[PDB]
Amino acid sequence: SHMASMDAASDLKSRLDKVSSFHASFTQKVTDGSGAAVQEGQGDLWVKRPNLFNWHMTQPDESILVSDGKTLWFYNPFVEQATATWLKDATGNTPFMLIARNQSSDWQQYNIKQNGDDFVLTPKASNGNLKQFTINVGRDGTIHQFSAVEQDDQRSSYQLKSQQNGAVDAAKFTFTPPQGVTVDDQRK
Amino acid sequence: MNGFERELQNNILGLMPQAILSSEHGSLNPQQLPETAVKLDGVNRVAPITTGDVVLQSARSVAVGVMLGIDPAQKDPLTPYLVNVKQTDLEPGKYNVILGEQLASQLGVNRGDQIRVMVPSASQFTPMGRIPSQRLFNVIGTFAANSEVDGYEMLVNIEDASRLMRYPAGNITGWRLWLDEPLKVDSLSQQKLPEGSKWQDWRDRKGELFQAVRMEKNMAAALEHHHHHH
Numbered sequence: 466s467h468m469a470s471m472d473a474a475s476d477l478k479s480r481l482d483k484v485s486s487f488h489a490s491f492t493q494k495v496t497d498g499s500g501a502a503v504q505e506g507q508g509d510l511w512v513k514r515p516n517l518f519n520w521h522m523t524q525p526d527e528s529i530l531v532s533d534g535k536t537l538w539f540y541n542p543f544v545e546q547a548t549a550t551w552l553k554d555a556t557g558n559t560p561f562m563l564i565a566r567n568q569s570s571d572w573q574q575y576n577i578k579q580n581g582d583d584f585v586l587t588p589k590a591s592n593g594n595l596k597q598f599t600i601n602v603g604r605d606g607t608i609h610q611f612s613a614v615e616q617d618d619q620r621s622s623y624q625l626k627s628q629q630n631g632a633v634d635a636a637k638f639t640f641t642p643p644q645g646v647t648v649d650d651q652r653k
Numbered sequence: 654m655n656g657f658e659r660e661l662q663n664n665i666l667g668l669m670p671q672a673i674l675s676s677e678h679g680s681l682n683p684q685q686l687p688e689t690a691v692k693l694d695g696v697n698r699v700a701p702i703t704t705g706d707v708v709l710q711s712a713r714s715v716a717v718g719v720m721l722g723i724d725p726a727q728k729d730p731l732t733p734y735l736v737n738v739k740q741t742d743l744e745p746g747k748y749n750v751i752l753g754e755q756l757a758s759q760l761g762v763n764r765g766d767q768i769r770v771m772v773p774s775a776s777q778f779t780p781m782g783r784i785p786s787q788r789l790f791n792v793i794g795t796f797a798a799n800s801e802v803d804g805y806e807m808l809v810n811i812e813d814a815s816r817l818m819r820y821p822a823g824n825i826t827g828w829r830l831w832l833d834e835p836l837k838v839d840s841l842s843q844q845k846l847p848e849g850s851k852w853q854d855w856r857d858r859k860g861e862l863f864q865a866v867r868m869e870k871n872m873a874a875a876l877e878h879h880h881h882h883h
Contacts, residue, residue, distance in 0.1 A: 546789065559780060621778060
């Protein structure tokens, strides 16, 4: 029934509404269609809704994605370069962006089932290459996990721990490159 | 050897990687398979290479290329053809690039400009999507060999190249081979290889040209045979 997905979309949103910013540790696991690991990592995540974030992967390699709300900075220490792009030109329909934005109009684009604290989302139609994603969200609005199955059956999951809800310093959402780092400013 | 084979050998195969001994999976560790372990038949010279197909973007245009990441201390077949630029300026960590002169004019760049180099085959998965490996490189000049390679090859430092390819630190694509007879890579590929290594050669770039030379050669021997019996 449609009434179960409306109910679930409304409960997903009310839960996520309780947390306007957070910090967490994360683990990331990505695998191809074969169930073989193609990337794994861990680090820190800061979010302030609707569109400020800092994803800082620290192992096995360092990389940073930081959004100041308009600019997305991608810092790759391996090449000593950071790129600047516009946030609006990124993939706006990743699971992560949905969770950051927490917009009712976004959630209305999915059929949603709630099994406990797991919300399972399937696109009401697809030419965007997500088949399914899942968000585990507690009653208090803490996110514990999210995972996505891409169209090529590539699978990614993120597990979040040590969540602290509450105010994050603005500095987390600005980027400053270390000494010696060059900037590729791609913003048109 | 006809003019066609001569042209291929002297003006194409002489200025690109004729063959490369790479890892069976992923990149190659030079500690696990060092240059000394590369003793192969039909090979007169071995050198480290990192290479891949790249997309290039300048302020004006887009182009496709082949990145030749080289040890700049050793002579490459392109080295003599550098135009007012020293190969040793391709210092590791500077992300300098020497472009084929036609590639440079396609992009509308020269010494002192930048280009963005992207490797579509090398990606990072992030929560904002898959991000291809890319970096700005500083154009420090060009080479002009009077060959089609002027329109697509470029030289960079091998180590810059390896980071762009997202290889584990210190790995390379493999061991570039120079052959006594580059036209017989068919036979030379069959030989005994070190273990968990594999053979790639110029047929990957120019499989339509190795087939056209082979067709022609067998048409020639068949008719010479027909002429000689009857």
